[PDB]
Design a protein around this ligand. Structure first.
Ligand code: NA
Ligand code: NA
Lengths: 306, 306
């Protein structure tokens, strides 16, 4: 059947993307109902990014200072609002292509689809994960601010991310659709420490469960370990600690196979201590931490009634 | 910054995805103008799949024997014709969401975006490359036939692939939108095998250039080798030879980096001889053959006006 990291079909999100222009700075905005959400720094000037006083800058701006465009049609702005680090532009027209949407804040280790846009036009879509240090290993160039991260559940598009900035390490940071930054970051061009980026342990365990189902099982031991002992070893090897919520997520895969979560944890604990030493798991010498138990269950090959 | 295997936005393709049902078997269909394209084995029963007489089966089929549904709306089939391995169903309505499009036959080593659909409804989008043996290492389940692969240039959607079946090895095969299969395969449940799967070397060279872009160069040498010598060494391993066209495609990468293409070839040549099996930490991270030079160029910052 094959395993592939998949983004959700972006057609619903592409219908809410508009161009927001302020001065000579143009970047993307999210048009839902009669509100357009965009990053704050559209109002910023070149010299005023080290420590912008956004509230003072916003007052000097007016409604006609913002140009919102959706294709050949231009949208008229009736008001501007600052919700944390996100600018809310009320327009005179509701988006007819507005889908059933809800705003969600995701936890580290979860995945979502990113629609990278430039000048208001969608350019590409990719799947990524929220790193434990609240960064994302995305692919963004200058002008990609305003791109949104999302997940589609049935018919409801659950928006969870908006891109703002790129850190010096090369990773990217942003806010939820309510303007609150993921992690201890601010939208200022000043030195900011992201913190150590640990490996998503729950996704690695799901990867190991996928390997066991597909036949890769050289790395298994009959031993079981306590959660405390595994968490101690995991942090010594820069693995994110395993919580009760992570174990609950791993429940379906552990039941589909015969391996208890702490049984698999003992296998991974000895894996970390000894290394892979020439052996490969699922065809790679490295482990995957951005493939979720959701992804494994939906894409795994099943038995065949003959 | 940041490199990610990105797929083209699937909105334009999403608007052409319909559900084609013949008897009890249901597949996906591509609705362009007043014609719906779908795999022809939709007319097959549970039997008639080991060795089908597609001409005989389709001659017995009637126009009302096909049920085409787009959302809740159901389209009437006014005509049916066979184009090689693909069924062309003329419907009573031209698709109003039809984009500017053309039918393209890709070459091995090139990439495109797959929109996986089930029951005519889009489910996920991922990027993949045509393997040297004309197979696809995709993620497909039963009922995914009719899913299409595409590339987007401006507003023109270049359809290049429609998924049909899965080989016992787990890889997938399909046809162009003209019904002609990619590879020596046929749409029959018979014993078929793909050719030797080799590494698309021009893509790994592009991957190495991206690693240089990210600031990692501790696996390069200052040596240069001729193309003929590299190809002999490369062909001894399971690597495809470099054509002059491949070098020309790699030219922009060399210009942006200052590393000669043959310089990078010698670096790869030395790595292979020293035992880069693709089974070590440095081999499994540097050996990626599904990231084209265009992807590296399209995700890089060019000359920067300061
Ligand atoms: Na164990
Ligand atoms: Na070299």
């Amino acid at each position: 059947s094959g395993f592939r990291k998949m983004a959700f079909p972006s057609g619903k999100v592409e219908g809410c993307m508009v161009q927001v222009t302020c001065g000579t700075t143009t970047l993307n905005g999210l048009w839902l109902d009669d509100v357009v959400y965009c990053p704050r720094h559209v109002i910023c000037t070149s010299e005023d990014m080290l420590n912008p006083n956004y509230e003072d800058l916003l007052i000097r701006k007016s409604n006609h200072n913002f140009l919102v465009q959706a294709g050949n049609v231009q949208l008229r702005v009736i008001g501007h609002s600052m919700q944390n680090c996100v600018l809310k532009l009320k327009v005179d027209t509701a988006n007819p292509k507005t889908p059933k949407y809800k705003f969600v804040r995701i936890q580290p280790g979860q995945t979502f689809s990113v629609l990278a846009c430039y000048n208001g036009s969608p350019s590409g879509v990719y799947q990524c994960a929220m790193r434990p240090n609240f960064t994302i290993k995305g692919s963004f160039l200058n002008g990609s601010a305003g791109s949104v991260g999302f997940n589609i559940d049935y018919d409801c598009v659950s928006f969870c991310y908006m891109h703002h900035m790129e850190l010096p390490t090369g990773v990217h940071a942003g806010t939820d659709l309510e303007g609150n930054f993921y992690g201890p970051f601010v939208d200022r061009q000043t030195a900011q420490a992201a913190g150590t980026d640990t490996t998503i342990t729950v996704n690695v365990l799901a990867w190991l469960y996928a390997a066991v189902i597909n036949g890769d099982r050289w790395f298994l031991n009959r031993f079981t370990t306590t959660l405390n002992d595994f968490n101690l070893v995991a942090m010594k090897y820069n693995y994110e600690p395993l919580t009760q919520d992570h174990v609950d997520i791993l429940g379906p895969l552990s039941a589909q196979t015969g391996i208890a979560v702490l049984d698999m944890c003992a296998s991974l604990k000895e894996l970390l201590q000894n290394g892979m030493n020439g052996r490969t798991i699922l065809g790679s010498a490295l482990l995957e931490d951005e493939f979720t138990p959701f992804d494994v269950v939906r894409q795994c090959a099943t038995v065949r009634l003959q």
